[PDB]
Each structure stands twice: as structure tokens, then as C-alpha cells.
Design a protein around this nucleic acid. Structure first.
Ligand SMILES: [Zn+2]
Lengths: 122, 58, 76, 58, 49, 166, 232, 44, 86
RNA sequence: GCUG
DNA sequence: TCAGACTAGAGCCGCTG
DNA sequence: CAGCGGCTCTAGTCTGTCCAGC
């Protein structure tokens, strides 16, 4: 079970959520009671996991938005981790970007931060 | 075959003389590859084989 | 493709032995067995009909290998 | 004793898929088994694979 | 165990071993001389051996 | 969340030879690596894809089929720069317990850094006042086997302001 | 007696037997008669599956004392063995699941190894199909006396029952008597006719022999036994 | 000498309980499962 | 049986021991230099760094270190006061 | 010691 | 009991300087 | 005139001697 590659993160919340939504509804098609005497830990993690991602209103979140938001993000010069925070955190209001958002120091400018609110709202 | 070889006699290399090991002791002598064995025998062919007077010289 | 077309005796013995163990462990039988209660008898019947799901990987001494399907090899 | 010795020494040899006879360490003893590649148990003749006079009459 | 008095069993000698090699019977030689005699498991440390 | 490329030797027992391998390996690998934190890696969840599946051997014993499987699985591992959103499933006087929603109730925040009205006084007081946000701060996992927990976290709460809720 | 030779190169094995050998020409050359007393002891672990479930149930019902029967039963993921002499066997037969192991008795058609004690070549150990018969000796057709160097003068021979499906196939395909009619050495046949099968054949094929229709039929009709029972 | 012994040889295979290379041990068997190697990946 | 009781002893105590911290006064001079150069040999150019830490780190980001009067006069004298060999 |  | 092909020794004489 | 060195030779010694049963 050796892990060859420790990391490779671009899985935005929507991606993982979407995979889980297809998985949950697909596992039940073949849901088995033979494997119950064996394994059931998988069911619990997927089930509860869906809810935490669901907290973020990825309900109504779309696949195209990932590229659409990304196209705006590349201009801002924020790092890949920062943008994932920006999509996953989905800052509802300016204060989270204004204060909660990472790398606030220097790059804030009170210019693109205001523009980001228009982009994040989109 | 070594268990079938009854260590027979009546063997003299065709010369009513020059006794040889045969059977299991001869196979044992070959596969051991010992540097000396019992009764080592060199067969020499004569070139002027026509008559006995040349044989007795060489 | 350099290796012999004919299946070797050693290859037949192992293919039947693995197939019989697989059949004895509840594997699907592709021969529609009629009145057979022994896994080795069922396995031999599968070989005659050339319906055994096993591929023989023949390893050359250098380390190169060629894979021959049980059906492709001629059975003598 | 002889049988034990011969077998211990020759147990390893195996005829390979590239028509060679190799030891376990991968050295070559023979480039083709017996010169022909042929099996002693399959000889219908005196060390030869067929006997053509018999086969044509059949 | 050794014999009939002790319900001992029978020996696969060094000569019967030589017969089975000549058949190429690799798994039967493993079944007879490991599985139906003295099969065991040991913990081996891969670091010190 | 992060993808983790992993390699496993997955053994399919011979009564599953009807089903396709890439599905029937995936049913095994979910039973192998779900709800299980891998040390220095994170909390595995499920199977993303099987990126490379190589050829099904069958060994001299088992009669089963052992395919070495390269795959990618999504795992849970905060990147030390994530502001998560969880729920307080517990309050201890040394520090609060937050839990991500039905994910893992194993995130234990120490609480020393929020505004100088900080104590938990055993009557379940959250914070002396002026969903819950969290900043995951360090990675901390302890390998369990020791003789003949395990992803715990430390979680911070700086001067975020928290405009909506205090 | 040292570990290298006594305990490693050659070792004592289980599922093995030994008895005096005696002739039986009515067996085929690939068969050996095994006495019921050995067959009730030497068991083979038959794994329960869709093809044999209804067969093994009848064997479990008969139990240890009747010959087509079973001595032990073992559950799927368990390694203790229920000794089938006790309990009610008709209940244990109903609770057979796939993946259980029934240790049935040795029955007709088992591949069984057969070996004289001094072995000088590979043909001294061959695999035979067992057939169970009442009398205590091991019995085989005298055409197979020449490979074993057996002579029926109070001789004893060993029997081994391979406990694995893979060990049956290697025994049957590689070590079967029909696959070993010729010695590896010079390629000459060793399983062939012997005394009273050469003398009877010689006297039959001499030119002085003439048979009428009644005695022709009564010699020929002897062959109509076994698999030849259906031929015209 | 601190010699390391290759367990490849016939006699040490019977001692260690592993199947010998010669005979039926010279080759490997693959199962002909209905499988798709290098399957379609989920896009990020 | 006379010794079959336990591990001989946890430790064996030698009735005579070490003398002192011998040469007490003057190694105050060498002893600080033991710690002085070790403060400067570690903080030197002639050392190596754990670049295996940076290949271990996939969390690289900006704002962290992972991301970021000799009063003298000229002269020239080259002496061979030393050996003329090798 | 004898049988194999 | 019967070699048996290893392992040192005792030399030996005669060139090897 | 003397010294290596290999030869050459005693002889010294440890190493085997079928499988299995009772
Ligand atoms: Zn260790």
C-alpha cells in the first residue's frame, strides 16, 4: 500500500463533492450485505463527508464555474493554494477576503480586493 | 544400470591378458575424475602396421 | 513467438491444477459439466473444449517473456 | 553412494525456453540439449527420432 | 513419529526426492516435503535479517 | 483535500471472477482504505480512479488473482493554510472541541489566541463574549502499534473579526 | 539422522499408508485396489461448491463408519474441525455452506501415489486411480510389476494421498502410468506383458490352435468387462 | 565470509518450502480477466 | 546456585574513582574556545544544508523563508619562509 | 539381530 | 575397513644472484 | 659462495561407505 506520490492538490470542494454524489448514488445500485460482515467504515465517511461539503452551497454550484472563476483568478496573481481557498472558502462577504483571506498583506491594495468581491459573488 | 552390473568377469580387453576394471568400479573411476586409476591403458596405432618386425622395434 | 507452439507436459499439468483449484473454490465452469463431482475431471473437460481462462507467460532465461493463451497452444 | 553424489551435482540443470541447458546460476552447460534438442524417451529408433522404413509401410 | 507402534508414518527419502525432481513435479515436492510435514511461520525482521 | 497516488497489491478471491476487475478491485480498495488515516499522508476516504492496473497474476498457493494496482485516492489532509467550517461537538476546560460535519470528531483546538475574554469554565461556556470557523494549524499523527488519536490537529482562531457571528 | 538429511532432504509425511502387495489382473494398468481400512482413514479435503454440494451431503450423512463417508467438517473462515462421529449428521449436512471443507473418505477415482521402497529411477513412483475393495492388500495388474521391481513374495509398498488439487494434477498428468509406459533412459517400454501373459499368448497364436464357434466366443467374451461392456 | 545465499537453487527451495524453478515453476500464469488497463481518468 | 539470583548487579561500583576535573585553572581558556568555534563552525560557509527538507515541502508559498570598517593599507610581500617540497 |  | 586427494612440513639441488 | 624457491616427497588427517521398516 506504499504511497508513491504524497501530494497533488487541485481537488476543489465541488470536484470532491461531485465525485461523492456520483459515488454515493452509484454504490447503492450495487450496495451489498455480503460485505457488511466485512467492511462498513466506507459508508460512514462518504455519507457524513457529503454533508460538510453540502454546508458550502455547492448545491447549485456548477462544473463550468471552476474554469470561469479560474479564468479571472489567473490575472490576480494569487497562488494555487490561495485560489483553492478562494473557491472552497467561497468568501460570502468582503470582510473574509478583506481580513480572513490569506496573503492580505501588501497584495490587498483596496483595488483588486474590491474587484474580487464582484468575481467571488459571480 | 549400476545396480544391474553384477561385477561380471570374463573381460580382458580382447587380448587374453591386460585385465581391466569394469562395472561399478569403472564408472566410479570415471565420475570421480581422479588423476590416477588402476590399469590405465594407452592404445597406440602403428603406422607401418604391415608386419611384426616393425612392431617389435617401436 | 520463437518458443515452441506445442503446449509442454509441465504446462498442461499446472494449467489443469490451477483451474481445478479455482473450480473447487466455486469459480464459474464454462463447459456445462454433466454429472461431474470432481474438480480435476471438470478441469480436464474444459481443456478439451479449449475454454480455460488462463494465459501462460513463458520467461526466456535472459528475462524477456512471451505470453501464450492456453487455446492458442496446440494440445497433444 | 554414487547415486547420491550424481544427483546432488546434477539436480539443478533445466532445459530452457530458448532451447539451452543452463545451471541455476545462469551459466551454460549446453547450447542445445544433446546436439539435436530431442528427447530420449521419444526415440522410436536406436537413438534416432524415426525409422523411415517402418513409417512408410504403415 | 518413527513407526507402526507410534502410528508414525512413512519417509520420503533422499532417493524418492530424486525421482520427483526428474518428473519436474515442483508443487508435489512442495506439498509432500513441506505442507504435509512441518509447515510453519516465522517473524523475520527485514532490517537485521 | 489532496489526491494521493498509491500502489497496492489487491487480491481478488476466485468467486468474483464474473465481475470486471477495475470495478471489483475498487470494491476491495474501498474496504481497504476508508476511514483510515495513513501516517504522514492523511485520512483516506474513497477511490478517485485507478490510473494503471497491471496484469493479474495467480500465485502457486491461493488460486486467487493478485493484481498490482496503481491508483489515486482522495484523502483528507489540511494544507496548514485552510480556514475550515466545523461544529463544536464538545467543550473541555483546556480547549474547545470542534468537529467537521460528520467528517471526523478528532480535531481538537487548543485555545490561547482569541481576544482576551478566553475561558471554558466546565459549564459548557464556548467563549466569554466580546457553524464555526477553524484554522487548522499543525500536522500531528502518531503511529499506534508499540508492543506485542492518530490525526489530531491543533486548531486556531485569530482576529478574524467574525462579522456575521461576533 | 542429522537435520540436513534426516529432517530436511528426506522427511516423514502424513496421509500415507503401507501394506503387503498381491496381484489382481482384473484391474486396469492405471488402477490400484485400496482396502477399505485404509480408505476410511486416508481422507481428502473436498471444498464445497455448486457441483458437489448434493454429493457431499450424502457422504456427511453416512459419516465415519460407512465407506462413502466423512470424518471431519470445517466451516468457511474457521480452522477448528468438527469430528463428525458425534452430533447429528443430518443437521450438519443441511448447514453446509459454499466454501466449507468436507474431509471425505478416499473413493473410486482418487489420484493416489504408489511406491516401492528402493527407488532407482523415476518410474518407481507412479500415480494410480484408486478403487476400493474389501481385502487388506494393495493390488495392481502384473504388467506394472517390471517398473516397481515387485515380486509378490510378501513385498510391501507405500501409498501417498496428495492433499491438494494442484498436487492431483501434477500427479495425474506427469506421473500417470499411461504417461510413463516407456523408461526415460533408452526409450523402451517397461509396462508390458509378463509370465502367463506371454506363455498364454504364445500358445494361443501357435498354428496348431483351432477353435469352434462356442469356444471362440467364450474366450472373446472375457474382454467384455469395464468400459468394453457397451461395444459390439 | 558473510556470504549471502541465493535461494534460487533446487535443494534450498525444498528446504525453505518454496516451489522450484525447474519444471512447472519456470513460468507464470495471468488471469484473462475482462479488464481495461489505463482506464479513463476523472478530469480535475 | 551461589550466583543464580539475578543479573549480577545493575552496575558495578569501583571503590576508587576518577580524580577530579583535572587541570582545573587554565582550561577555562581552551574550554570557552571549545564552545566558541562550535558556535562559528556551525554558522560558517563550510557547511551543508538540508535541501531534502525543501524537496520534502510541497507547501511552498510567498511570505515565508522557504520562498525567500576594515581599516587597512595596501602592501604585497610573498615569503618563502616555508618548505620547498612536495 | 532380522525382515523388507 | 579402505582409500583418498587435500594440508602442512622435511628436505634437494642447482642456478641466481 | 650463498640463498630463494619450487619441487618433491612423506605422511597426516579427516572424510565418506542405500533405502527403509519393525
Ligand atoms: Zn530487527
Amino acid at each position: 500500500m506504499e504511497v508513491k506520490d504524497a501530494n497533488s492538490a487541485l481537488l476543489s470542494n465541488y470536484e470532491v463533492f461531485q465525485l461523492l454524489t456520483d459515488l454515493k448514488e452509484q454504490r447503492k445500485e450495487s450496495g451489498k450485505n455480503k460485505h457488511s460482515s466485512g467492511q462498513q467504515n466506507l459508508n460512514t465517511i462518504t455519507y457524513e463527508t457529503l454533508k460538510y461539503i453540502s454546508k458550502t452551497p455547492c448545491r447549485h454550484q456548477s462544473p463550468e464555474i471552476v474554469r470561469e472563476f479560474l479564468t479571472a483568478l489567473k490575472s490576480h496573481k494569487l497562488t494555487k493554494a490561495e485560489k483553492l481557498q478562494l473557491l472552497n472558502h467561497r468568501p460570502v462577504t468582503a470582510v473574509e477576503i478583506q481580513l480572513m483571506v490569506e496573503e492580505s498583506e501588501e497584495r490587498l491594495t483596496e483595488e483588486q480586493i474590491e474587484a474580487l468581491l464582484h468575481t467571488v459573488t459571480s | 544400470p549400476g545396480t544391474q552390473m553384477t561385477l561380471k568377469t570374463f573381460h580382458f580387453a580382447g587380448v587374453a591378458s591386460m585385465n581391466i576394471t569394469l562395472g561399478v568400479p569403472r564408472i566410479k573411476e570415471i565420475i570421480n575424475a581422479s588423476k590416477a586409476i588402476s590399469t590405465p591403458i594407452i592404445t597406440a596405432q602403428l603406422d607401418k602396421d604391415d608386419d611384426a618386425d616393425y612392431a617389435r622395434l617401436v | 513467438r520463437i518458443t515452441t507452439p506445442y503446449m509442454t507436459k509441465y504446462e498442461r499439468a499446472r494449467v489443469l491444477g490451477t483451474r481445478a483449484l479455482q473450480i473447487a473454490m466455486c469459480a464459474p465452469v464454462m463447459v456445462e459439466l454433466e454429472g461431474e463431482t470432481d474438480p480435476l475431471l471438470i478441469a480436464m473437460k474444459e481443456l478439451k473444449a479449449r475454454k480455460i481462462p488462463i494465459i501462460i507467460r513463458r520467461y526466456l532465461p535472459d528475462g524477456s517473456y512471451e505470453d501464450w493463451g492456453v487455446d492458442e497452444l496446440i494440445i497433444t | 553412494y554414487m547415486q547420491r553424489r550424481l544427483v546432488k551435482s546434477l539436480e539443478d540443470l533445466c532445459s530452457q525456453y530458448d532451447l539451452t541447458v543452463r545451471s541455476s546460476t545462469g551459466d551454460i552447460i549446453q547450447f542445445i540439449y544433446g546436439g539435436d534438442g530431442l528427447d530420449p524417451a521419444a526415440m522410436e529408433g536406436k537413438d534416432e527420432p524415426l525409422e523411415f522404413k517402418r513409417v512408410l509401410d504403415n | 513419529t518413527e513407526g507402526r507402534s507410534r502410528d508414525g508414518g512413512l519417509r520420503l527419502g533422499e532417493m524418492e526426492r530424486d525421482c520427483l525432481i526428474g518428473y519436474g513435479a515442483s508443487m508435489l515436492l512442495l506439498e509432500r516435503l513441506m505442507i504435509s510435514s512441518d509447515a510453519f511461520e516465522v517473524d523475520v525482521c527485514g532490517q537485521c535479517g | 483535500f489532496v489526491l494521493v497516488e498509491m500502489v497496492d497489491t489487491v487480491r481478488i478471491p476466485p468467486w468474483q471472477f464474473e465481475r470486471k476487475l477495475n470495478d471489483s478491485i475498487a470494491e476491495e480498495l474501498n474496504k481497504k482504505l476508508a476511514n483510515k488515516v495513513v501516517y504522514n499522508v492523511g485520512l483516506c476516504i474513497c477511490l478517485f480512479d485507478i490510473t494503471k492496473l497491471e496484469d493479474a497474476y495467480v500465485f502457486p498457493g491461493d488460486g486467487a488473482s493478485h493484481t498490482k494496482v496503481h491508483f489515486r485516492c482522495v484523502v483528507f489532509h489540511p494544507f496548514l493554510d485552510e480556514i475550515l467550517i466545523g461544529k463544536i461537538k464538545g467543550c473541555s476546560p483546556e480547549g474547545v472541541h470542534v468537529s467537521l460535519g460528520f467528517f471526523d470528531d478528532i480535531l481538537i483546538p487548543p485555545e490561547s489566541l482569541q481576544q482576551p475574554a478566553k475561558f471554558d469554565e466546565a459549564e459548557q461556556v464556548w467563549v466569554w463574549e466580546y457553524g464555526e470557523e477553524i484554522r487548522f494549524r499543525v500536522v500531528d499523527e502518531s503511529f499506534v502499534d508499540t508492543s506485542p488519536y492518530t490525526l489530531v490537529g491543533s486548531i486556531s482562531e485569530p482576529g478574524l473579526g467574525l462579522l456575521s457571528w461576533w | 539422522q542429522g537435520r540436513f538429511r534426516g529432517n530436511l532432504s528426506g522427511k516423514r509425511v502424513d496421509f500415507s499408508g503401507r501394506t503387503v502387495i498381491s496381484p489382481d489382473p482384473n484391474l486396469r494398468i492405471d488402477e490400484v485396489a485400496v482396502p477399505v481400512h485404509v480408505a476410511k482413514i486416508l481422507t481428502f479435503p473436498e471444498k464445497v461448491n455448486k457441483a458437489n454440494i448434493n454429493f457431499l451431503r450424502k457422504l456427511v450423512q453416512n459419516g465415519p463408519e460407512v465407506h462413502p463417508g466423512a470424518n471431519f467438517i470445517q466451516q468457511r473462515h474457521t480452522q477448528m474441525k468438527r469430528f463428525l462421529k458425534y452430533g447429528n449428521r443430518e443437521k450438519m449436512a443441511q448447514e453446509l455452506k459454499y466454501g466449507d471443507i468436507v474431509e471425505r473418505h478416499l473413493i473410486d477415482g482418487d489420484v493416489v501415489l504408489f511406491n516401492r521402497q528402493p527407488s532407482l529411477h523415476k518410474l518407481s513412483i507412479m500415480a494410480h486411480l484408486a478403487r476400493v475393495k474389501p481385502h487388506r492388500t494393495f493390488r495392481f495388474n502384473e504388467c506394472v510389476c517390471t517398473p516397481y521391481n515387485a515380486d509378490f513374495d510378501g513385498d510391501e509398498m507405500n501409498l501417498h494421498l496428495p492433499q491438494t488439487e494442484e498436487a492431483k494434477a501434477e500427479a495425474l498428468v506427469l506421473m500417470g502410468t499411461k504417461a510413463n509406459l516407456v523408461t526415460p533412459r533408452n526409450g523402451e517400454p517397461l509396462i508390458a506383458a509378463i509370465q502367463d501373459f506371454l506363455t498364454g499368448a504364445y500358445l494361443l497364436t501357435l498354428k496348431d490352435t483351432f477353435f469352434d464357434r462356442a469356444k471362440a466366443c467364450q474366450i472373446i467374451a472375457s474382454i467384455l468387462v469395464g468400459k468394453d461392456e457397451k461395444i459390439k | 565470509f558473510g556470504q549471502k545465499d541465493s535461494v534460487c537453487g533446487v535443494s534450498e527451495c525444498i528446504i525453505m518450502g518454496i516451489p522450484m524453478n525447474i519444471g512447472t515453476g519456470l513460468f507464470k500464469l495471468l488471469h484473462k480477466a475482462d479488464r481495461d488497463p489505463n482506464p479513463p481518468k476523472r478530469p480535475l | 546456585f551461589s550466583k543464580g539470583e539475578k543479573l549480577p548487579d545493575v552496575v558495578l561500583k569501583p571503590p576508587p574513582l576518577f580524580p577530579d576535573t583535572d587541570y582545573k585553572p587554565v582550561p577555562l581558556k581552551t574550554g570557552e574556545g571549545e564552545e566558541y568555534m562550535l558556535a562559528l563552525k556551525q554558522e560558517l560557509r563550510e557547511t551543508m544544508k538540508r535541501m531534502p527538507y525543501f524537496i520534502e515541502t510541497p507547501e511552498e508559498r510567498q511570505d515565508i523563508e522557504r520562498y525567500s570598517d576594515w581599516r587597512r593599507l595596501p602592501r604585497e610581500m610573498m615569503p618563502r619562509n616555508k618548505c620547498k617540497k612536495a
